[PDB]
């Protein structure tokens, strides 16, 4: 389209970052529960 493509890419990158952070937090919580 235009300048909205960069904003959409940044939003997708932020969503992926948040998903990775949530997955890492869930893995850490599971490891702590197992320990």
């Amino acid at each position: 389209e235009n300048q909205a493509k960069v904003t959409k890419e940044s939003d997708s990158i932020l969503n992926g970052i948040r998903e990775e952070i949530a997955h890492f937090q869930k893995e850490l919580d599971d490891l702590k529960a197992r320990t």
């Binding site: 939003d11 932020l14 970052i17 952070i21 850490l28 702590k32």
Partner: protein
Amino acid sequence: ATAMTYAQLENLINKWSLELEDQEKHFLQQATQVNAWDRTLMQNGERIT
């Protein structure tokens, strides 16, 4: 979502490193307890023999 910045990334890395060091200390304490139990069992077996 939340705008990730250099300070936020540094804080997250520091928190993860602190949690890793705490887990390492807990594992070291567990290993020390296991070694003490192993030494006690070895002494008991050497006495029973």
